[PDB]
Scaffold this active site. Structure first.
Site, short mmCIF file in Angstrom:
data_model
loop_
_atom_site.label_atom_id
_atom_site.label_comp_id
_atom_site.label_asym_id
_atom_site.label_seq_id
_atom_site.Cartn_x
_atom_site.Cartn_y
_atom_site.Cartn_z
N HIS A 12 0.87 -1.14 0.00
CA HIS A 12 0.00 0.00 0.00
C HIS A 12 0.91 1.19 0.00
O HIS A 12 1.79 1.31 0.85
CB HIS A 12 -0.90 -0.05 1.21
CG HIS A 12 -1.76 -1.26 1.24
ND1 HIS A 12 -1.79 -2.14 2.30
CD2 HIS A 12 -2.61 -1.77 0.31
CE1 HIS A 12 -2.64 -3.11 2.04
NE2 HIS A 12 -3.15 -2.91 0.84
N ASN A 61 -3.20 -6.19 -2.04
CA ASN A 61 -2.98 -7.21 -1.00
C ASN A 61 -4.11 -8.21 -0.88
O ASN A 61 -4.16 -9.00 0.06
CB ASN A 61 -2.66 -6.58 0.35
CG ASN A 61 -1.95 -7.55 1.28
OD1 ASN A 61 -1.05 -8.29 0.86
ND2 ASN A 61 -2.35 -7.56 2.53
N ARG A 62 -5.03 -8.19 -1.83
CA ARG A 62 -6.16 -9.09 -1.75
C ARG A 62 -6.29 -9.99 -2.97
O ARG A 62 -7.19 -10.82 -3.03
CB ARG A 62 -7.46 -8.30 -1.46
CG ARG A 62 -7.46 -7.63 -0.07
CD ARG A 62 -8.85 -7.64 0.61
NE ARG A 62 -8.84 -7.41 2.07
CZ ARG A 62 -7.84 -6.90 2.81
NH1 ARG A 62 -6.67 -6.52 2.26
NH2 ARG A 62 -8.01 -6.76 4.12
N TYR A 155 -7.92 -13.55 3.12
CA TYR A 155 -7.61 -12.87 1.87
C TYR A 155 -6.26 -13.35 1.32
O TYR A 155 -5.39 -13.79 2.08
CB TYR A 155 -7.69 -11.33 2.02
CG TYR A 155 -7.12 -10.76 3.31
CD1 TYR A 155 -5.84 -10.21 3.34
CD2 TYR A 155 -7.86 -10.75 4.49
CE1 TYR A 155 -5.31 -9.67 4.52
CE2 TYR A 155 -7.33 -10.22 5.68
CZ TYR A 155 -6.05 -9.69 5.68
OH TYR A 155 -5.49 -9.16 6.84
N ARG A 159 2.38 -11.65 0.59
CA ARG A 159 3.33 -12.57 1.17
C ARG A 159 2.85 -14.02 1.19
O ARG A 159 3.59 -14.91 1.63
CB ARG A 159 3.73 -12.11 2.57
CG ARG A 159 2.74 -12.47 3.63
CD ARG A 159 1.82 -11.34 3.83
NE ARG A 159 0.78 -11.62 4.80
CZ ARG A 159 0.01 -10.67 5.32
NH1 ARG A 159 0.18 -9.39 4.97
NH2 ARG A 159 -0.93 -11.00 6.19
N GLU A 169 2.85 -5.56 11.06
CA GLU A 169 2.05 -4.35 11.09
C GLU A 169 2.32 -3.52 12.35
O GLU A 169 2.42 -4.06 13.44
CB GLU A 169 0.59 -4.74 10.99
CG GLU A 169 -0.34 -3.55 10.88
CD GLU A 169 -1.31 -3.69 9.73
OE1 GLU A 169 -1.24 -4.70 8.99
OE2 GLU A 169 -2.15 -2.78 9.56
C1 LIG Z 1 -4.34 -1.52 7.26
P1 LIG Z 1 -3.38 -2.69 6.29
O1 LIG Z 1 -3.61 -2.39 4.72
O2 LIG Z 1 -1.96 -2.54 6.64
N1 LIG Z 1 -4.05 -4.13 6.60
C2 LIG Z 1 -3.62 -5.23 5.71
C3 LIG Z 1 -3.67 -6.51 6.56
C4 LIG Z 1 -2.42 -7.40 6.44
O3 LIG Z 1 -1.29 -6.85 6.37
O4 LIG Z 1 -2.64 -8.63 6.42
C5 LIG Z 1 -4.55 -5.37 4.46
O5 LIG Z 1 -5.77 -5.16 4.58
O6 LIG Z 1 -4.00 -5.70 3.39
ZN LIG Z 2 -1.10 -2.08 4.42
#
Ligand SMILES: CP(=O)(O)N[C@@H](CC(=O)O)C(=O)O
Ligand SMILES: [Zn+2]
Ligand SMILES: CP(=O)(O)N[C@@H](CC(=O)O)C(=O)O
Ligand SMILES: [Zn+2]
Lengths: 301, 301
Positions: A12, A61-62, A155, A159, A169
């Site tokens: 992100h 990331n999804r 999801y 990684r 995180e």
């Molecule tokens: C708030 P984020 O974007 O760091 N949360 C991740 C969660 C993660 O890192 O698994 C996501 O929704 O892709």
């Molecule tokens: Zn993130």
């Protein structure tokens, strides 16, 4: 035996700790090298990092799943989808033996979560040992582990390409801001992760252990209007209270008129990602989690 | 004497406290009426709001000037220029007598500022009295006044449309996040601003008064790269320490290494907008201010 290791940054593009670390490390990798261990730093979403936005077309990331990883490469595809395969090809392919052994994915959150490790498989004895090492080292600086099975709600992450996926995180930090206290927390987490790998490669032995973790049960959206506009906001007593127990009687939401909406249901839960900026769009005000213990068998090189 | 009054939300689309309040007030404005006083709530940048973003083409709170407000209404023009002309015809025209009397512009900042009032004219008796009133009513909640009167560094704000512009600014809050405590604070501030107008319109005598304000002197950019990239971050001693005095030998930036970069110059300053997200692109790590006292002559009508 662990050979290939990467640290991803900027999945992100408006989460800057990772972006700043990985950009620094692409220039001078000393801090993340260990004798007989090469770790690759790498920026997953370069265009979003350029606009300092979460993503360009859809959330990177999804999408590391068969539905997207198998589409025919074409410049009609959403950017993040083209980027997904590009990455899969370099660090995977996923579900294969050529794929990297360990990928660390760096993230920031607006929620008051502190150092948090995201665990993708409850049965994995290596990951449980790595996390136990990381929690214990960081102490008394608090550090929690969030777990995702489900069944429905897991999801497909960047990684997940690796054999051993690790989410790192750290929050709270607003998007598009670099804070020193956060940057210091994250680079500590990485330090201990890499040290564990070195003490695994150097044939060290790890006795059985137990870590506490928080299992996902359900996501809760905000109370909404008839048009679908947010009608209540996170109650002050729930704000910044991630990880702390929320009891059936306790206040969840508050409206402008000033009425309190309480939790309800049978039991006590543990809220996670309370009031994350990025999840307004995804309709998740916070995650409900159950506290539960995970046991690991011993491990050797 | 004061009859035309407006409250603007959503000048910046990802600043939600104002959006939420104004949207509530469009549907029920009982909270912002006072007997014998008509108050309009109004969303200034509806498209940025829709996209939960700061702006579409350019920053709306910077273009209320002759150059933009006087070009011919076209479709080639950026959204915000076109929208500023509409706001000017609705609530202006600017510098004219049948413009609105008072406009409140609601904003949020990622900086640790608490309740902040932004003053545009230092010689303006009416606002100095209103600011004095609001500070006194909020006590012991602190409330700070930022004087953006230059010479060359004054931009052209949505609220400058009125004869009595008021910026209301509350932080710390991440962009795109709605926090109860911040929502409470802005309400209290609006309540007392409206209470002031009411008392004024009801012939209440106001004695002379003095307020400490913080005058803009200089903006400070992060140390940049050979490629023009952030090479150091706000030092943790400076982080979250808006309004506090900073002396010449004091830590100001930190590198990843980390070398401390101190202030320098020959006198004490007061930083504001320390680490504001929306200003990374403006190239401004924080603004340097001097603390100074303003006087208001008494007023009545
Ligand atoms: C708030 P984020 O974007 O760091 N949360 C991740 C969660 C993660 O890192 O698994 C996501 O929704 O892709
Ligand atoms: Zn993130
Ligand atoms: C962080 P902000 O959007 O409140 N900054 C404003 C400051 C102001 O209200 O003058 C601006 O740049 O227009
Ligand atoms: Zn703003």
């Amino acid at each position: 035996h662990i050979q290939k290791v990467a640290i991803f940054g900027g999945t992100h593009g408006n989460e800057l700790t990772g972006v700043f670390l990985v950009k620094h490390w692409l220039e001078n990798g000393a801090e993340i090298q260990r004798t007989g261990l090469e770790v690759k730093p790498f920026i997953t979403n370069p265009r979003a990092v350029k606009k300092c936005t979460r993503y360009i077309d859809c959330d990177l990331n999804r999408i590391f799943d068969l539905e997207n990883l198998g589409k025919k490469m074409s410049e009609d595809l959403p950017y993040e989808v083209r980027r997904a395969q590009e990455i899969n090809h370099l660090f995977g392919p996923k579900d294969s033996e050529d794929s990297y052994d360990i990928i660390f994915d760096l993230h920031n959150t607006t929620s008051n979560m502190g150092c948090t490790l995201i665990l993708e498989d409850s049965r994995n004895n290596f990951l449980i040992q790595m996390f136990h090492y990381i929690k214990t080292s960081l102490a008394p600086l608090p550090c929690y582990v969030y777990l995702i099975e489900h069944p429905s709600l897991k999801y497909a992450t960047t990684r997940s390409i690796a054999k051993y996926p690790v989410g790192i995180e750290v929050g709270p930090q607003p998007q598009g801001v670099l804070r020193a206290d956060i940057l210091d927390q994250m680079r500590k987490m990485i330090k201990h992760a890499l040290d564990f790998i070195h003490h695994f490669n150097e044939g060290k032995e790890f006795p059985p252990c137990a870590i506490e973790v928080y299992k996902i049960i359900e996501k809760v959206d905000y109370p909404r209007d008839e048009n679908g506009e947010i009608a209540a906001i996170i109650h002050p007593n729930l704000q910044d209270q991630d990880w702390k127990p929320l009891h059936p009687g306790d206040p969840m939401f508050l409206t402008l008129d000033g009425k309190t909406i309480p939790l309800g249901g049978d039991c006590t839960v543990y809220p996670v990602f309370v009031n994350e900026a990025a999840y307004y769009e995804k309709k998740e005000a916070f995650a409900k989690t159950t506290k539960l213990t995970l046991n690991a068998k011993s491990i050797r090189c």
